Amino acid sequence: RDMPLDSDVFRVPPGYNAPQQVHITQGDLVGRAMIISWVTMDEPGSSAVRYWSEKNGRKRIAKGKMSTYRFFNYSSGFIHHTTIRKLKYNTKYYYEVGLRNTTRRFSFITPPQTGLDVPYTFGLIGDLGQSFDSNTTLSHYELSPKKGQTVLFVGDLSYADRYPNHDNVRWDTWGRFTERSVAYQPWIWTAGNHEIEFAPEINETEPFKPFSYRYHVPYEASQSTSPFWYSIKRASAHIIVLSSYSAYGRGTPQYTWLKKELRKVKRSETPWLIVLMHSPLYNSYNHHFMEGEAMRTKFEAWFVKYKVDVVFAGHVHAYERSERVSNIAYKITDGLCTPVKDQSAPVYITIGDAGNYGVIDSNMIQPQPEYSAFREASFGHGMFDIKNRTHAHFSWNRNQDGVAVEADSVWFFNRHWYPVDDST
Amino acid sequence: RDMPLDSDVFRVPPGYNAPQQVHITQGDLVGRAMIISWVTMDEPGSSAVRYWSEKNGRKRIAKGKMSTYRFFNYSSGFIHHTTIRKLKYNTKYYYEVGLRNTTRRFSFITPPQTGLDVPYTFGLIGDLGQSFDSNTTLSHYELSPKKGQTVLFVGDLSYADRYPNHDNVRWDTWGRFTERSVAYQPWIWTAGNHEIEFAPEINETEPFKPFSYRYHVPYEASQSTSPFWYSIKRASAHIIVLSSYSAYGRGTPQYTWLKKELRKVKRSETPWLIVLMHSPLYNSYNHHFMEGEAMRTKFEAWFVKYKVDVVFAGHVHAYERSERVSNIAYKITDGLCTPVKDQSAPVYITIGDAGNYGVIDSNMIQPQPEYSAFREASFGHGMFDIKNRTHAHFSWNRNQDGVAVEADSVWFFNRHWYPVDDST
Ligand SMILES: *[C@@H]1O[C@H](CO)[C@@H](O)[C@H](O)[C@H]1NC(C)=O
Ligand SMILES: *[C@@H]1O[C@H](CO)[C@@H](O)[C@H](O)[C@H]1NC(C)=O
Ligand SMILES: *[C@@H]1O[C@H](CO)[C@@H](O)[C@H](O)[C@H]1NC(C)=O
Ligand SMILES: *[C@@H]1O[C@H](CO)[C@@H](O)[C@H](O)[C@H]1NC(C)=O
Ligand SMILES: *[C@@H]1O[C@H](CO)[C@@H](O)[C@H](O)[C@H]1NC(C)=O
Ligand SMILES: *[C@@H]1O[C@H](CO)[C@@H](O)[C@H](O)[C@H]1NC(C)=O
Ligand SMILES: *[C@@H]1O[C@H](CO)[C@@H](O)[C@H](O)[C@H]1NC(C)=O
Ligand SMILES: *[C@@H]1O[C@H](CO)[C@@H](O)[C@H](O)[C@H]1NC(C)=O
Ligand SMILES: *[C@@H]1O[C@H](CO)[C@@H](O)[C@H](O)[C@H]1NC(C)=O
Ligand SMILES: *[C@@H]1O[C@H](CO)[C@@H](O)[C@H](O)[C@H]1NC(C)=O
Ligand SMILES: [Fe+3]
Ligand SMILES: [Fe+3]
Ligand SMILES: [Zn+2]
Ligand SMILES: [Zn+2]
């Protein structure tokens, strides 16, 4: 069900060496930097970026770096990544890319300065892919009346690896597909399993290669030593991104980083604490049932302990929401291995239903267990609308519904400022 | 309690550019290849190795490769790794190293050809370190009347990382310390946590660096894409080595490899199936209690399913033995989260009590749970003496005891050829 190559959506911007696949993300820790990334296919081109604010039209230039990679019998075009920095908060910015030959203009708006009661609305999309369904989700999100300002991307980007030799063209199509959204608003990236691409047979054995060349993150802004896990503060939220397919052993770098990072969170500054990951820790569908177990046995307590608000995952092509629940009592022989409501525990939501290759996971465990608050096998996206330091309203729009129909909806009470039972 | 630098044990072989830190390991999948590794400190030197069999004294030469690494303000000497191959089975071999200036002679014996009833005796040492205690273990093993022929090394080699800036000299001392054993009989290597050495502060952030330069394994012989996990067949046993601090997510390379590898095991050819890892899956001591949980939730079933015989780990500086037990029934809400005797499950033994920096873990969970068959906080090593395709006799010598005193002893009944209850 993957949109074919001719698809209008996959069309290449006209012009010799026309910057295609333009896509941006947060470039620093708190909001005043952007990473502009694009691809030129005719010849290398200039990695410079021209930008200026709407108000003070003083045009400035930032210079980036260009790279290329080979996959198997594939060869990338020229990939460029430039980082504009020291932007002013809350400001529309105009940036042009492709200065040497055919220039393309775009705009993005710096977010507000980090704050206790600074509202912001994130869209949640995970497991996008490039089926027609995916097209639909992307448009539903594009139209949600409460308009999203940043997309938290929970993993599995293009499924190019389903194609033979992971036909990296499918990475180029996807890049072009999603441009309409990403060239204007950042998408926070999360490594999914489809990103791994461990292909020994074709002699590709460096995990996350194509992904890593195409998508960059300010991992160094947190003090991560790897792009596969990092964090960003934006508006009022503090976002930690983890890697299910990287390592979390005790003492390993991801483990070491997450621990320290959790201690660096300041709720007085960023009331909302959100965590992202691909494989979900709490899941009641049959598909991938219990994979999150390992990472669960490692990070749950921390999450409960620091009172993280929500945890979004993908990986299960469907939707599900949970009760604020923990299960941190088991000690092997003591039999306390059953999830209990705990109000310090986060609400685990899974939204890997944005489309993939057009297939939904419907087989679920009968009957819906206590921990599971609401679950449905439909394609859709989500929105997490932060209001105050106490309120944030999550929503779930189904692809079947009209753009403004909230198939599911929930008010989040800040685990830190207003810990009242938001459970139902 | 770490033996000081002057220690006779740490002495440098006399001679200009005298090959020091000589140490060998299996170089192929089935036994007819050796990897000779040494270090020259004065100048690069020749990476050639001269070898010949006792019988046919036709001296041959194998050429290796030389490398060096810098750690922080440290700089290795010249490390050499040469692989002699196509050796004859069961044959004493003589090899000389350091041909250009001061040559040193050693010998090793190829093992017997892989077989159903081929006996062999492995020594188990884990968590060695370089305290006086360590010295003692090494000697106890050196004297065990049933003489070991290969040492299965369960992780944590030298604890150089306890020193400041991980003073890599301590890696050089350890290398010299253990030479008396390793230059003559292979030690199968397992990455321990102390091997990770993730030191961002001193700008060292590549996991396992010093370890990886100094110790090499025939990972490519299995079809591993990383030295951190591999397998070797020797005598009658099939040995799988895993990495607790590498990644095991579903789809990750280690995960992918272990699965396939387990399918490649032929019990009709190698009756004994042994698995190595550092962090133990079943552990009743307080120290590191429940760390193996994650990797457990991922590989246990496989082990039960393939009927692996034993699983050795280190990490807990003490000793413990278990009942053939599984705990593969939990499905979250069903409460079946308690270990039961299962005769298809392996016996999990932990021997991280070879010495470390001279400290034993004694705090254990009271009372000793059902799954735990025998546990004690003493320094020691182990021997796993394979007899037939049905019998193998494990033993545990305490450092307090005399060389031939088996503080613990157990007969192993082959999970495949003779699955009778060896439990007690
Ligand atoms: C890559 O190889 C496949 C067959 O192995 C072939 O069909 C395909 O067209 C090739 N692609 C390129 C860009 O050469
Ligand atoms: C591209 O830009 C260069 C320099 O601006 C110019 O000389 C060249 O002719 C342009 N057109 C093409 C097709 O390269
Ligand atoms: C994708 O959706 C856009 C609008 O949402 C539409 O203009 C376009 O034709 C669609 N293309 C496909 C292949 O669905
Ligand atoms: C490439 O193809 C397969 C993958 O394992 C193998 O036969 C071959 O050795 C691989 N590597 C090279 C360098 O050809
Ligand atoms: C939080 O927002 C809700 C509506 O979402 C509102 O009713 C409530 O009074 C707000 N709290 C503050 C402190 O303004
Ligand atoms: C490395 O630095 C430490 C202090 O940072 C110093 O005491 C030590 O002697 C140095 N080692 C070398 C080999 O320079
Ligand atoms: C080492 O060997 C070389 C060549 O065999 C020789 O010329 C040299 O003088 C020897 N001695 C030293 C100290 O290098
Ligand atoms: C280590 O043990 C050996 C024999 O086992 C002995 O000769 C040596 O002196 C000992 N050294 C230390 C520092 O214990
Ligand atoms: C080296 O020391 C610390 C480690 O994080 C840091 O201050 C510095 O930036 C590091 N890197 C370099 C290149 O100095
Ligand atoms: C296995 O070895 C034991 C002693 O360890 C012996 O009693 C038994 O008969 C042997 N089995 C075979 C088939 O020889
Ligand atoms: Fe997916
Ligand atoms: Fe240890
Ligand atoms: Zn997935
Ligand atoms: Zn350890």
Atom of ligand 3 nearest to the CA of A132: 14
> Are the Cβ atoms of A198 and B252 closer than 8 angstroms?
yes
Q: What is the DSSP letter of B59?
A: -
Out of B114, B144, B169, a domain closes at: B114
Residues A358, A397, single domain; the answer is yes
How many residues are listed for chain A in this entry?
A: 424
Residues A138, A210, single domain; the answer is yes
CA distances from B65 to B40, B41, B68 (A): 13, 15, 10
Amino acid at B363: N
> Are the Cβ atoms of A335 and B331 closer than 8 angstroms?
no
Whether the bond into B112 is cis, omega within 30 of 0: no
Is the CB of A333 inside a 6 Å radius of any atom of ligand 1?
no
Is B287 catalytic? The answer is: no
Residues B88, B129, single domain; the answer is no
> Are the Cβ atoms of B223 and A200 closer than 8 angstroms?
yes
CA–CA separation, A265 and A270 (whole Å): 8
**Domains: count for chain A:** 2
> Are the Cβ atoms of B196 and A337 closer than 8 angstroms?
no
> The domain that contains A26 carries what CATH number?
2.60.40.380
> The domain that contains A360 carries what CATH number?
3.60.21.10
Q: What is the distance between the terminal CA atoms of chain A, rounded to a whole angstrom? A: 36
Instruction: Please enumerate residues of A whose Cβ is less than 8 A from a Cβ of B.
Output: 193, 196, 198, 200, 205, 207, 223, 225, 244-253, 256, 279, 290-291, 293-295, 297-298, 327, 330-333, 335, 337-339, 369-371
Give a yes or no: residue A12 inside a domain: no
How many CA atoms within 13 Å lie on the side-chain side of A143?
A: 16
Nearest in space to B416 (alpha carbons), one of B258, B305, B277: B305
Full residue range of the structural domain in which residue B227 is found? 115-424
Enumerate the β-bridge partners of residue B408. Answer: B396
Amino acid at B409: S
Reduced to 3 states (helix: H, G, I; strand: E, B; else coil), residue A199 is strand
Residues B160, B78, single domain; the answer is no
Give a yes or no: residue A209 inside a domain: yes
Beta-carbon contacts of B2 under 8 Å, excluding residues fewer than 6 positions away, are B129, B130, B131, B159, B357, B358
Q: What is the DSSP string of A344-402?
A: TSPEEEE---S-TTT-----BPSS--TTEEEEE---EEEEEEE-SSSEEEEEEEESSS-
Give a yes or no: residue B276 inside a domain: yes
Q: What is the distance between the terminal CA atoms of chain B, rounded to a whole angstrom? A: 36
Amino acid at B327: N
CA-closest residue to ligand 10 atom 7: B391
Residues B324, B415, single domain; the answer is yes
| Side-by-side strand order, sheet with B20-26 | B20-26, B33-40, B78-85, B65-67
CA-closest residue to ligand 10 atom 14: B388
| Residue showing tokens 């499918």 | A170
Out of B66, B94, B114, a domain closes at: B114
Question: For residue B175, what are its two tokens?
Answer: 């290398």
Distance between Cα B387 and ligand 10 center (Å) = 7
Resolution in angstroms comes to 3.0
Residues A150, A206, single domain; the answer is yes
* Phi, psi (rounded to 5 degrees) for A321: -135, 150
Give the residue ranges of DSSP H helices in B268-388. 293-305
Nearest in space to B223 (alpha carbons), one of B274, B264, B190: B264
Residues B108, B249, single domain; the answer is no
Q: Quick one: chain B helix, strand, coil %, rounded to 5?
A: 20, 30, 55
Enumerate the β-bridge partners of residue A107. Answer: A94
Give a yes or no: residue B13 inside a domain: no
Residues A99, A214, single domain; the answer is no
Indicate the top mutation candidate among B70, B72, B165, B203 to test ligand 9's pocket, ranked by most ligand atoms within 8 A of CB.
B203
Distance between Cα A162 and ligand 11 center (Å) = 11
How many residues are listed for chain B in this entry?
A: 424
Residues B108, B130, single domain; the answer is no
Residues A331, A383, single domain; the answer is yes
Q: What is the DSSP letter of B196?
A: H
Out of B64, B85, B114, a domain closes at: B114
The distance of A32 to chain B (nearest Cα, Å) reads 26
Residues B317, B352, single domain; the answer is yes
| Side-by-side strand order, sheet with A60-63 | A60-63, A48-53, A92-97, A104-109
Give the residue ranges of DSSP H helices in B187-337. 193-196, 209-214, 253-263, 293-305
CA–CA separation, A69 and A197 (whole Å): 14
> Are the Cβ atoms of B198 and A249 closer than 8 angstroms?
no
Which of the ligands is closest to the CA of residue B165? Answer: 6
B223, closest residue in chain A (CA to CA) = A200
Give a yes or no: residue A153 inside a domain: yes
Question: What Rg value do the Cα atoms of chain A yield, rounded?
Answer: 21
Beta-strand runs (E) in A283-350:
310-313, 319-322, 325-326, 340-341, 347-350
CA–CA separation, B87 and A38 (whole Å): 55
A294, closest residue in chain B (CA to CA) = B294
Give a yes or no: residue B278 inside a domain: yes
Contacts of A251 in chain B (CB under 8 A): 193, 196, 198, 245
CB atoms under 10 Å from CB of B264, counted, come to 12
Is the CB of A418 inside a 6 Å radius of any atom of ligand 5?
no
Ligand 9 pocket list (CB less than 6 A): B 200-201, 203
CB atoms under 10 Å from CB of B114, counted, come to 19
Amino acid at B160: A
CA–CA separation, A296 and A277 (whole Å): 11
Nearest in space to B148 (alpha carbons), one of B351, B381, B307: B381
Q: Obtained via which technique?
A: X-ray
CA–CA separation, A191 and A132 (whole Å): 22
Question: For residue A277, what are its two tokens?
Answer: 């990951």
Which stretch of DSSP H or E encloses residue A304?
helix A293-305
Buried b / exposed e over A340-352, threshold 16 CB at 10 Å, is eeebebbbbbbbb
Burial class (CB in 10 A: 0-12, 13-18, 19+), A338: middle
Phi-psi region of A257 (alpha: psi -120 to 50; beta: other; left: phi over 0): alpha
CB atoms under 10 Å from CB of B223, counted, come to 14
* Phi, psi (rounded to 5 degrees) for A372: -80, 115
Q: What is the DSSP letter of A108?
A: E
Give a yes or no: residue B57 inside a domain: yes
Give a yes or no: residue B420 inside a domain: yes
Question: For residue A189, what are its two tokens?
Answer: 């990236």
Residues B283, B396, single domain; the answer is yes
Are A153 and A188 a contacting pair, CB within 8 Å? yes
